[PDB]
Paper text:
Here we report the mechanism of three Fe(II)/α-ketoglutarate-dependent dioxygenases in bicyclomycin synthesis, which depicts the natural tactic to sequentially hydroxylate specific C−H bonds of similar substrates (cyclodipeptides). Three αKGDs (BcmE/BcmC/BcmG) catalyze site- and stereo-selective hydroxylation of inert C−H bonds in BCM’s (bicyclomycin) cyclic dipeptide scaffold, one of the simplest peptide derivatives without additional functional groups. Our hypothesis posits distinct regulatory mechanisms: BcmE employs steric hindrance, BcmC relies on inherent reactivity, while BcmG utilizes a directing group to control C–H hydroxylation. Although these three enzymes share only 35–42% amino acid identities, the overall structures are similar, and r.m.s.d. values are 0.70 Å (SsBcmE vs SsBcmC), 1.07 Å (SsBcmE vs PaBcmG) and 0.87 Å (SsBcmC vs PaBcmG), respectively.
The carbonyl group of the amide part of the DKP ring is stabilized by a π-π stacking interactions with the aromatic ring F273. Additionally, Y308 forms hydrogen bonds with the NH group of the DKP ring and the hydroxyl group of Y120. Two water molecules mediate the hydrogen interactions between carbonyl groups of DKP and residues R111 and D275. The 5-methyl group of the DKP ring is oriented towards the iron center, suggesting that hydrogen abstraction is likely to occur preferentially at the C-5a position. This observation is consistent with the activity of SsBcmET307A. The presence of a rotatable single bond between C-4 and C-5 brings the possibility of C-7 closer to the iron center, thereby preserving the reactivity observed in the wild-type SsBcmE. We found the steric hindrance of T307 could bring C-7 closer to the iron center. Conversely, mutations Y120F, V304T, T307A, and Y308F enhanced total activities (72%–95% total conversion yields) and produced a new C-5a-hydroxylated product 1a (2%–27% conversion yields). As expected, the dominant active conformations for hydroxylation in the F273A, T307L and T307A systems are C-6, C-2’ and C-5a (shown in the dotted rectangle: 49/5000, 90/5000 and 14/5000), respectively, which is consistent with our mutagenesis results and structures, particularly the crystal structure of SsBcmET307A•FeII•αKG•1.
Author numbering: 6 to 312
Amino acid sequence: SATLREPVVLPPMPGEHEARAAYPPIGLERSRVTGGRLVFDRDEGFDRALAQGFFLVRIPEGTDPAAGDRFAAHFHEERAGGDPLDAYRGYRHVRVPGDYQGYFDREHDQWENFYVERDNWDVLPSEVARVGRGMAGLGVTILRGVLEHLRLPREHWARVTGGLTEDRGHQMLAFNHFRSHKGVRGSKFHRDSGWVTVLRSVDPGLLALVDGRLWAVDPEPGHFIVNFGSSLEVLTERLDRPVRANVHGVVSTERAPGQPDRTSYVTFLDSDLTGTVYRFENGTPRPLQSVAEFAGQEVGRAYDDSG
Ligand SMILES: CC[C@H](C)[C@@H]1NC(=O)[C@H](CC(C)C)NC1=O
Ligand SMILES: O=C(O)CCC(=O)C(=O)O
Ligand SMILES: [Fe+2]
């Protein structure tokens, strides 16, 4: 396959406590959307963020995470009965049509997921879908800002991003509940499959694996964490400034009785799943692989799933 990239040895995932002091945090560049575009605080911040593959972006004022935070804390629970909050529960029993969508009980990971692409956001409380709309819209603006910063000619963008820069593509809100009762890794070490991931988290536990070094990626109040995905990496790997999709994963979280579990949620921006994966070679975006086969490949690596 033309999109494999070179092998990455994945170490066992450390426990939360031992990781907390052993692996110091990456220093992330800060940025915000202002004047209608992504702007970094520091003059070389954009270049450093593309090289780092992680950075921070201010939560835009029109995006209030509150409803998403509440949904993330409850979606995995059984309905209580006679309880208004049940509107935010029971989603392990909610079917969502489409590949890679719906509820997932990951056998070998702490997390269980509820994944909903934008065309299916009516299955969510409207106020929760509204958070996904703000995060995904931010993610598209960031993607536009990246491709402009790379000076990639705009005539290519809609094709090579499978519609994302035209606000189409596969835009997926993803809720994670880390089941602290499971004595395994929080997640597998993985690359995200797509272009730009916007991550809402408040707790430590995310690690970056970079050329055999483990470093923490710590959230910052009032900001999202942003990283890049394998589709952007493959697109740019032969260019003079390649963009890195970092390998990352969540520690085996540790919670005593009564301590709330870790949660997080993201918007993944993937190419349209009927499209093609491209790589710039000799100025031209070369078609390498269908997005369908690429997705199956990348999802197959990101989880240890016998089905
Ligand atoms: C690849 C693994 C990571 C955690 C995440 N999981 C998914 O299922 C989607 C699949 C995409 C093709 C819609 N993308 C992602 O980045
Ligand atoms: O929970 C986190 O900090 C990261 C989650 C993540 O990597 C993912 O959802 O793909
Ligand atoms: Fe991820």
